[PDB]
Amino acid sequence: ADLKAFSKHIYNAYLKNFNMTKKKARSILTGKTAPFVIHDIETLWQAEKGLVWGLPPYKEISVHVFYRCQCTTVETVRELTEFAKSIPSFSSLFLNDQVTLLKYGVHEAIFAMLASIVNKDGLLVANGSGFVTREFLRSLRKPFSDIIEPKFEFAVKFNALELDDSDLALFIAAIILCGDRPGLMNVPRVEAIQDTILRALEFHLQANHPDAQYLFPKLLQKMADLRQLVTEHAQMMQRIKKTETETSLHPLLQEIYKDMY
Ligand SMILES: CC[C@@H](Oc1cccc(CN(CCCOc2ccc(OC)cc2)c2nc3ccccc3o2)c1)C(=O)O
Ligand SMILES: CCCCCCCCO[C@@H]1O[C@H](CO)[C@@H](O)[C@H](O)[C@H]1O
């Protein structure tokens, strides 16, 4: 009862704050308008010249994709921040504790939600109006071609669990409310909120996925998988900042990756 309403509150905060939902994504990816496919240089250009679509000064094809990728991340961080403010008691934390949770949590949540817009062949872009192929991303020059590929591997496995948006709302909330983030001041308070979230998640999963047996423990493992995925992503990003000294890294991403792990 308490948990059912708590889950509903989180769900509505999710629907309120995220422009792209899995319901919308799967509808686009299954055909019910069709996205413009971006599979090489020429189609990427066509996607820029109206159709589908501010950025740093143009450098090259691979850096351009890198820049558009960052812009989308920054926008999703804005959404996750507003979503977190609706998680009961998150706003009661001191401001720097809120930032600490978002700093170490947003990319874990981003990569979880990324699975919603992905299939084995590519992912939606531009609010679902475009589709960039996995192959085209593989064809970019290193190191940029190695950024997104490992996320496809996680996403395909994650999509096998067949979560819906109501499940994901609680899942993302549990990711953000994480008591072991470095520098967190009020660990007991954050652990207490997370426990409420996780209890609501188990209650919600058995009501929404009755025939799903080990779904809750599987999602706990997914949370651990996302932390290592992000650790390896932070390494790549920290490397690229050192290697690609002429490519711009958005200030928000610089701050997120600042001595992270
Ligand atoms: C770069 C540094 C960046 O790493 C990454 C690595 C992998 C994935 C992301 C986040 N992401 C980008 C998808 C593709 O992004 C494009 C965009 C345009 C394009 O070609 C024109 C090709 C790829 C995303 N979208 C979402 C939509 C809904 C929900 C969650 C979403 O998560 C960031 C970081 O560290 O933040
Ligand atoms: C309060 C606003 C936060 C941004 C402050 C400075 C923004 C500097 O410029 C940023 O560089 C990024 C590099 O990819 C671009 O992608 C961004 O679109 C651009 O705004």
Residue numbers in the entry: 173 to 204, 208 to 228, 234 to 441
The publication says:
The PPARδ-LBD–pemafibrate cocrystals, similar to the PPARα-LBD–pemafibrate cocrystals (reprinted from Kamata et al.), were obtained without using coactivators, whereas the PPARγ-LBD–pemafibrate cocrystals were obtained only using SRC1, suggesting that its physical interaction with PPARγ-LBD is the weakest. The electron density of pemafibrate in PPARδ/γ-LBD indicated a single molecule in the protein monomer similar to that observed in PPARα-LBD. Their overall structures were identical to the active conformations that form the AF-2 helix 12 (arrowheads in Figure 6A,E,I), with RMS distances of 0.75 Å (234 common Cα positions in PPARα/δ) and 0.71 Å (226 common Cα positions in PPARα/γ). Pemafibrate was located at the almost identical Y-shaped structures comprising the Center and Arm II/III regions in all PPARs although its phenoxyalkyl group seemed to be pushed toward helix 5 in PPARδ-LBD and its 2-aminobenzoxazole group seemed to be pushed toward helix 3 in PPARγ-LBD. Hydrogen bonds between PPARα T279 and water molecules were also observed in PPARα, whereas a water-mediated hydrogen bond or electrostatic interaction with 2-aminobenzoxazole group of pemafibrate was observed in PPARδ-LBD. Pemafibrate was further stabilized by hydrophobic interactions in all PPARs. In PPARδ-LBD, bezafibrate was located at the Center/Arm II regions, where the potent PPARδ-selective agonists such as GW501516 and GW0742 bind, and only pemafibrate was located at the Arm III region as in PPARα-LBD. The concentrations at which pemafibrate (known as a selective PPAR modulator α “SPPARMα”) activated PPARα were three orders lower (107% efficacy and 1.40 nM EC50) than those at which it activated PPARδ (11.3% efficacy and 1.39 µM EC50) or PPARγ (119% efficacy and EC50 > 5 µM). Pemafibrate activated PPARα/δ/γ-LBD-mediated transactivation, PGC1α/SRC1 recruitment, increases in thermostability, and bound to PPARα/δ/γ-LBD with the similar Y-shaped forms, although it acted at much lower concentrations on PPARα-LBD than on PPARδ/γ-LBD.
